Design a protein around this ligand. Structure first.
Ligand code: VVW
Length: 290
């Protein structure tokens, strides 16, 4: 690979730490990511190939690198910090999100008797709305750069130490012509439950397909990390989607938010809100509840 001086970062300024998940992602310390503070430490996440990697895996990581170079920076996405391409393995260095993904963030903070605050869990309605608003802003940014995520879900939204939402894994080759719809992950996720019907049935992806997935994500937020289509296996999901099935309104979810969910799941993609409209609708709610 050729040297791109805009992005190249010396690999000896990285100290790799414990893995985060699986290419594979490992936490690391970086020294001098800001060239004005060359000895300053920061914590970053490093994407790299697995040991068993094929040349297709390498081309996929290179392609994700190139996408991330072109996407530019935004507060509500995981941003590219640097790359290591010379004289060693390929590393793509990105922001680290210290609280992990939004699904695990919410599930760990579900509401609960000593003291005056015993009924009070960590999550409040305005902060849930803010999480949704920040994801919509991130997606509005990605859309403006012509990026379709294709698997927007709470597990692909990461949370920083300051509760900033950052969309992750938006630049990936997703193998859309060879999806195993019955695939269950090691944590029990069925990713087909986030796919818009035009994507699932017709292999068509647009920004409006991401809007459908955003509606599923909204339902995940207001169930505090619930799994969508409760109890419905994939075979039944296909039949229910052909019949126009939609999820019920979650408990303790105001009708403004369930209304937004149902708009995101309108059958016609043109009848779903845009991300610009979702940003505006969620900002109105967020401002009203301060
Ligand atoms: C660095 O800020 C950091 N990060 C995490 N967690 C984390 O997930 N960071 C992360 C992951 C990531 O992509 C991976 C593949 C991923 C994962 Cl692991 C899970 N779901 C989706 C995805 Cl897409 C990217 C990218 N791109 C960026 N950042 C972290 O953790 C700690 C353990 N924990 C926390 C959340 O609940 C469950 C697990 C820790 C850190 C840095 N810190 C902070 C605290 N100190 C004490 C230790 C530490 O290493």
């Amino acid at each position: 690979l050729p040297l791109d001086p805009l992005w190249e970062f010396p690999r000896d300024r990285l100290v790799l730490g414990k893995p985060l998940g699986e290419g594979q992602v490992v936490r690391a310390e970086a020294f001098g990511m800001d060239p004005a503070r060359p000895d300053q430490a920061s914590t970053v996440a490093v994407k790299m190939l697995k040991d068993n990697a094929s040349d297709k895996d390498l081309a996929d990581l290179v392609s994700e690198m190139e996408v991330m170079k072109l996407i530019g920076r935004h507060k509500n996405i995981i941003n590219l910090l640097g790359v290591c391409t010379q004289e060693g393995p390929l590393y793509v260095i990105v922001e680290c999100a210290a609280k992990g993904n939004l699904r695990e963030f919410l599930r760990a903070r579900r509401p609960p008797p000593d003291g005056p605050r015993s009924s009070e869990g960590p999550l409040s309605f305005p902060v849930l709305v803010s999480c949704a608003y920040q994801v919509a802003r991130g997606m509005q940014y990605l859309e403006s750069r012509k990026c379709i995520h294709r698997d927007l879900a709470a597990r692909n939204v990461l949370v920083t130490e300051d509760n900033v939402m950052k969309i992750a894994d938006f630049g990936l080759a997703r193998g859309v012509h060879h999806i195993d719809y019955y695939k269950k992950t090691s944590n029990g996720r069925l990713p087909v439950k986030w796919m818009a019907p035009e994507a699932l049935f017709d292999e068509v992806y647009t920004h409006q397909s991401d809007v459908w997935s955003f509606g599923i994500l909204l339902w995940e937020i207001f169930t505090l990390g619930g799994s969508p289509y409760p109890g419905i296996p994939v075979e039944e999901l296909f039949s229910l989607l052909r019949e126009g099935h939609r999820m019920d309104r979650p408990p303790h979810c105001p009708p403004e938010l369930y209304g937004l969910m149902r708009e995101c799941w309108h059958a016609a993609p043109s009848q779903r809100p845009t991300f610009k409209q979702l940003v505006e609708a969620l900002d109105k709610v967020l401002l009203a509840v301060s």
